[PDB]
Ligand binder design. Structure first.
Ligand SMILES: Cn1cc2cc(C(F)(F)c3nnc4ccc(-c5cnn(C6CC6)c5)nn34)c(F)cc2n1
Length: 302
């Protein structure tokens, strides 16, 4: 009734006055009460170009304290670009898959992206840790899990656009979740991104398909490309792709027909899968449901 004590569902109207009405109801379904979440600003567990990520404490229908990471959007200053960002990714609320990063809620100067806590961090930093010992079968299992969640996202006609081993997280059961999409989309390691200078688009050149560099029209076939590079990172346990090829001549490398070489510890049937995902004709690349068929057969056998 008042300016000072409005109901929670109305605080979407108040603190997000630049939002679509369609989107007002969308983020009205996913509001988090401030008295139900404590944000630890004492330590940052993640930094992105829109803001930092903090450890949080979400309180549910019972007092149960579920750990979380809470993504801050403080650095995006324009309260109309914020509204655009919520327009891009609120569709995450409809997604539910064991291999996909879910969204717990949006709290409320910018809003707060409340996401499940990932005990083991991102997929790349895990496979690169000296003190970690994943076998060959393990890393293929990781590439199996991302293929499933990708197959789920592909079924929603959803183009993630930035599939890479730095953008998939690991919970405490080592379930891989595709992340870095929607409200979680950001640049969590700036080194690999080119900002286009007409479109503001952010480009992960080492992971983008060849048609994506020529046109900037991302598709479901272009994530298949990014998935085989993801296979490549796993088999090299997180090595940078194309260390002898800087971003500029990357197109010259791929227009010649040259791809990433077979790693020392990648089975030939798995490296053959990589080459099919990098086919110059996008419509002839394997689907994510065909990928899950091939990788499972490779993951079981030796
Ligand atoms: C302990 N924990 C931290 C979390 C961060 C997020 C996140 F930030 F929101 C997020 N969503 N998708 C992604 C994809 C990649 C990264 C990411 C972060 N760091 N890195 C390494 C430097 C490159 C990649 N984060 N991320 C999350 F949802 C849950 C989390 N749990």
């Amino acid at each position: 009734s008042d300016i000072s004590s409005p109901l929670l569902q109305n605080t979407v109207h108040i603190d997000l006055s630049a939002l679509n009405p369609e989107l007002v109801q969308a983020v009205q379904h996913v509001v988090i009460g401030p008295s139900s979440l404590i944000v630890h600003f004492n330590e940052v567990i993640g930094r992105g170009h829109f803001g930092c990520v903090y450890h949080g404490t979400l309180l549910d229908n019972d007092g149960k304290k579920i750990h979380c990471a809470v993504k801050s959007l403080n650095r995006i200053t324009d309260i109309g670009e914020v509204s655009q960002f919520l327009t891009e990714g609120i569709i995450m609320k409809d997604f539910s898959h064991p291999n996909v990063l879910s969204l717990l809620g949006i709290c409320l100067g910018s809003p707060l992206v409340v996401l499940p806590y990932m005990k083991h961090g991102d997929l790349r930093n895990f496979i690169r840790n000296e003190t970690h010992n994943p076998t060959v079968k393990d890393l293929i299992g990781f590439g199996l899990q991302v293929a499933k969640g990708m197959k789920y996202l592909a079924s929603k006609k959803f183009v993630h656009r930035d599939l890479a081993a730095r953008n998939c997280m690991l919970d405490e059961k080592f379930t891989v979740k595709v992340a870095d999409f929607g409200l979680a989309r950001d640049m969590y390691d700036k080194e690999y991104y080119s900002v286009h200078n007409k479109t503001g688009a952010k480009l992960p050149v080492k992971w983008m398909a060849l048609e994506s560099l020529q046109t900037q029209k991302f598709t479901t076939k272009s994530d298949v490309w990014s998935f085989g590079v993801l296979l490549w990172e796993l088999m090299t346990r997180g090595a940078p792709p194309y260390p002898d090829v800087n971003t500029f001549d990357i197109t010259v490398y791929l227009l010649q027909g040259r791809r990433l070489l077979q790693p020392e510890y990648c089975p030939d049937p798995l490296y053959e899968v990589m080459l099919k995902c990098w086919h110059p004709k996008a419509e002839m690349r394997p689907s994510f449901s065909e990928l899950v068929s091939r990788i499972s057969a490779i993951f079981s056998t030796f």
